[PDB]
Each structure stands twice: as structure tokens, then as C-alpha cells.
């Protein structure tokens, strides 16, 4: 449900 | 400022599907929604503009549609390079605000993944530290097991994994477990195994080295 | 074309302030607006402000008083500026223009700039070599260990190599440094014809390093 700095993605 | 709600949170399809992302509205905007794309890595790419208006480059796959609160972005065949996160943005009240997102996972067959071990290098060992690394390549679905021994002890807390996200070619995940010691305690031991779990695999896979041959 | 180019990712003090140029190509700077969007893992997508063709200024209610946003149309750059940063002003920025000059669809993007907010010092990575040791694949990578901040980047033989390429994403050390390793498989036949060299490059520390992987 967040976005990750580290894939541009989200997760969780 | 306008609420955007995107639904679902995760979407998940198999390639030749189709497949509708929803974006809800905390009141009407008219017509004045964008759609963007975001690969791994990557900046956003613009999709849709005004719930329906076509993109130069972007493929007809794409569409968009609604009025008002509900509006809903279409991919009516869906394949692989698809692999992204898909937001919604609206622009007829200021600030322009944008949705959470959905996440778009492909489906596919079982892939059983190929397990490499990497024993520490001597130019790291200098250091006073090693790292074995345990590689699980090219394998569905995402959920792996790695189980690391160092002469049959149970290695536990002192091993991390970082997983890829899906492969936009083959929709496939890549894995690599790092098992740390010191190199203390790497020099006194001498068998180093990882063990794999998938569901591709009928029974567990182990790959191992002696330290030095 | 048309592009839009930042500098460099970097590491901020708490309480410092925040500095990124965008170069553009392919247009004026006094024909469109130029608009600033981060994205954040607490906030998502959110967009920061806009300089218009005019010069004039544009920032979103939140940021009114530590934003600021100024320009060269000579030179081509937009210049972004916020103060104060905390924790939580750790994202990536982008600048980013529209269709038209007027309006706010988002056709063209910079590459983005991740920005850590941290008191930490920088320090660049390590890299040691996976060597390569079934069925005619076999697998080579580099282990990239012990730097901060964020990101680093990894290409194979200066971008000639690409296919088979996994980069895993970077994960937090208990040290408060990063990690990561990036493989590719080759043929094993290749192992004694080809070169096999992972380029490193950390930013933030300027250091640029090129590991040649062999067997051992």
C-alpha cells in the first residue's frame, strides 16, 4: 500500500 | 483538497485478460481526470488525459471512461510490459491532487526457480566479513523458502532477501538470500548450504560449496 | 525531443534546506510551466508547485513558505529550493512539463531525484565479485556493500549487456547501510571469450567503480 524510494513501487 | 480512492489496491490478471482500475471522486470534478503508468524504476507516464482523450505513443489497449465521481481506466488485453502501478490524478479544483495507486500483478504458470551459491570472495574476507549469497533465478510464484547450514547448524537471524519485481518479459521474480558471518567464524566451518522451497520443485533444492574446494 | 534532466541524487541534513536543477531541452523555458511533483512512501503522489513562462509562481498551500522556485530561460534550468527539511521530506522530486502551458496533464517527466533527509554521513560502497563456478547458464554478479544513501546504479559491460540482468532492490544493513547485488546468466562457454564487468556508480559519494567478475 506504500511507495518504495528504493523500486519507485508500491508494497504493502 | 480532493480525495481520490483507487480500488482496487491490488489487481491481479493473467495477460489477454481485461482489466478496469477504478478511481472515486470526494466530488464531482466533471471530466478533468488524468491516468499515469509507473514501471519499476521509472517516472510516471501518461495514459489517459481527461477521463477518455487519447496519448500520442501509448497503445490502443488503453481507455478511460466516467463522468462525475466514478471514473474507470481499461487495458482490454493485457500483457506483460503492463507490469506497473497505475494512478489517477484530477485537475478541476486546486491543488491537483492524485490517487494511492492499484498495483497490477500478472498471472502465470508455475516456474520452478534456478538455485546458484556464492561463496565470499577472497577480497571481501579482508575485511573481516563474508558474505554467501544464494541466488533463486527466474521463478513463479513469488512465495520461496531459503534455508541456510553451516555443517548441519541451523542458520538463523544473520540472513537477508531481496526480492525483483516481476520481470516484464516472462512475469517472473528473482531472489537472492545473503547469509553474513564473520570471518572468524566463516574460517571455522566448512560446509555451506542453502536449501530452496517452491512449489515448481517436487523437493526441496540444495546448493552447496566447501570452503576452499 | 523533448527532455527533462535533474541533478544528481543526494543526502540532507535535518533542518537544511533542498536544492535540485532541472535542465530542459526541446522547448523554452518561456514557452511552458514548469512544475514540481515529489512522491513520498507517507503522502504518494503530490504536487509542490509550477514557475510559469512569465515567471510567475505557483506553490501548493502546504509548502508556501519554504518553497521557492526560480529560473534561467538562457540557460534552461529551473531551480528548486525548500527549507527545512525533515524525515518525512524524504522523497523522490521530479519536475515535470505539460501538453500546453497552461495546464496540469503531465506528458513529459524529469528522471527524478531521490532525496534522503538524514544526519547520517555519506559513504560510498564496496564491491566484491560473485564468481561464477548449470546446463550450459551459468550465473555472475557483484555484491555492492556498505553505502548510504540511496541509489545506486548497476550496468553490465557500460550497457551492452542487458539481457538476463537482475538488479535486486537495496536492503538496510543493522549498520544503516545498504546492500544489494546484481546478477546476469551467460553461457558458460562465454566465460573464457567475453568480459564480464559490472558498472557501479554511488552519486551521492562520487564513487565509480568497474568490477571485472571471473571465475576463480
Known amino acids: 500500500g506504500q511507495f518504495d524510494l528504493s523500486t519507485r513501487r508500491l508494497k504493502g | 483538497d480532493i480525495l481520490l480512492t483507487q480500488s482496487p489496491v491490488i489487481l491481479s490478471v493473467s495477460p489477454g485478460e481485461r482489466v478496469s482500475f477504478s478511481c472515486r471522486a470526494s466530488?464531482?470534478?466533471?471530466?478533468?481526470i488524468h491516468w499515469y503508468q509507473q514501471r519499476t524504476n521509472g517516472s510516471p507516464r501518461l495514459l489517459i488525459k481527461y477521463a477518455s482523450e487519447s496519448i500520442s505513443g501509448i497503445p490502443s489497449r488503453f481507455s478511460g471512461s466516467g463522468s462525475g465521481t466514478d471514473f474507470t481506466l481499461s487495458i482490454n488485453s493485457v500483457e506483460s510490459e503492463d507490469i506497473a502501478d497505475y494512478y489517477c490524478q484530477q485537475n478541476n479544483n486546486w491543488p491537483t491532487t492524485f490517487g494511492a495507486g492499484t498495483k497490477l500483478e500478472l498471472k502465470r504458470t508455475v516456474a520452478a526457480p534456478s538455485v546458484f551459491i556464492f561463496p565470499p570472495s577472497d577480497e571481501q574476507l579482508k575485511s573481516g566479513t563474508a558474505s554467501v549469497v544464494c541466488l533463486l533465478n527466474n521463478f513463479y510464484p513469488r512465495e520461496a523458502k531459503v534455508q541456510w547450514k553451516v555443517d548441519n547448524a541451523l542458520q538463523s537471524g544473520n540472513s537477508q532477501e531481496s526480492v525483483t519485481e516481476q520481470d516484464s518479459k516472462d512475469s517472473t521474480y528473482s531472489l537472492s538470500s545473503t547469509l553474513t558471518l564473520s570471518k572468524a567464524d566463516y574460517e571455522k566451518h566448512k560446509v555451506y548450504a542453502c536449501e530452496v522451497t517452491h512449489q515448481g520443485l517436487s523437493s526441496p533444492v540444495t546448493k552447496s560449496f566447501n570452503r576452499g574446494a | 525531443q523533448v527532455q527533462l534532466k535533474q541533478s544528481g541524487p543526494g543526502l540532507v541534513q535535518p533542518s537544511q534546506s533542498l536544492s535540485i536543477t532541472c535542465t530542459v531541452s526541446?522547448?523554452?523555458?518561456?514557452?511552458?510551466?514548469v512544475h514540481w511533483v515529489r512522491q513520498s512512501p507517507g503522502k504518494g503522489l503530490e504536487w509542490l508547485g509550477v514557475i510559469w513562462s512569465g515567471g510567475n509562481t505557483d506553490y501548493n498551500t502546504p509548502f508556501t513558505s519554504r518553497l521557492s522556485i526560480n529560473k534561467d530561460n538562457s540557460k534552461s534550468q529551473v531551480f528548486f529550493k525548500m527549507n527545512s527539511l525533515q524525515s518525512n521530506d524524504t522523497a523522490i522530486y521530479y519536475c515535470?512539463?505539460?501538453?500546453?502551458?497552461?495546464?496540469?496533464?503531465?506528458?513529459?517527466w524529469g528522471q527524478g531525484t531521490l532525496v534522503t533527509v538524514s544526519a547520517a554521513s555519506t559513504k560510498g560502497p564496496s564491491v566484491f565479485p560473485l564468481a561464477p563456478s548449470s546446463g550450459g547458464t551459468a550465473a555472475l554478479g557483484c555484491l555492492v556493500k556498505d553505502y548510504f544513501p540511496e541509489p545506486v546504479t548497476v550496468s553490465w559491460n557500460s550497457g551492452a549487456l542487458t539481457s538476463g540482468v537482475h538488479t535486486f532492490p537495496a536492503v538496510l544493513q543493522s549498520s544503516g547501510l545498504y546492500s544489494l547485488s546484481s546478477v546476469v546468466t551467460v553461457p558458460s562457454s562465454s566465460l573464457g571469450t567475453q568480459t564480464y564487468i559490472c558498472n557501479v556508480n554511488h552519486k551521492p559519494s562520487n564513487t565509480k567503480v568497474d568490477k571485472r567478475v571471473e571465475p576463480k
Open positions: 515535470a512539463r505539460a501538453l500546453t502551458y497552461y495546464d496540469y496533464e503531465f506528458a513529459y
Open positions: 466530488q464531482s470534478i466533471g471530466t478533468n
Open positions: 526541446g522547448f523554452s523555458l518561456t514557452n511552458y510551466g
